[PDB]
Design a protein around this ligand. Structure first.
Ligand SMILES: Cc1cc2n3c(c[nH]c(=O)c13)CN(C(=O)c1cccc3ccccc13)c1ccc(CS(C)(=O)=O)cc1-2
Length: 111
């Protein structure tokens, strides 16, 4: 799915993921994780490919994505980073709220 058509759909997803309707659970993913400031010990040992929505937006604005799948890969990388580093009952609950938005809207892509 290399179409612009599909990439436009992904672009609508990103803007919805950055909208104020989801800010309550989404804003921890707006910018890169500041592990050193937040005392996230070993964060960059355990997480070798950081990702966040500011990075996904840059890549989308620079038209660096070749198809929707690369897009999805990055968004799921961001969520996976969160699940891998944190315990199951870490306030991870915000990631699953946002991922439910992303996944349902990704599944609705034309094709
Ligand atoms: C992907 C991600 C983002 C954060 N992460 C944390 C643990 N593991 C993660 O994967 C993770 C630790 N973290 C918190 O625990 C936290 C404390 C106080 C209020 C919160 C409200 C919502 C979510 C987290 C917090 C905070 C704190 C602040 C920032 C924003 S910034 C520019 O300063 O880096 C990011 C995270």
């Amino acid at each position: 799915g290399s179409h612009m058509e599909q990439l436009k759909h992904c672009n609508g997803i990103l803007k919805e993921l950055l909208s104020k309707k989801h800010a309550a659970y989404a804003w921890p993913f707006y910018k890169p994780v500041d592990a050193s400031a937040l005392g996230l010990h070993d964060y960059h040992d355990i997480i070798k490919h950081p990702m966040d929505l500011s990075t996904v937006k840059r890549k989308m604005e620079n038209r660096d994505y070749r198809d929707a799948q690369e897009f999805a890969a990055d968004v799921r990388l961001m969520f996976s980073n969160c699940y891998k580093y944190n315990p199951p009952d870490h306030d991870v609950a915000m990631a699953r709220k946002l991922q439910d938005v992303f996944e349902f809207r990704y599944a609705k892509m034309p094709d």
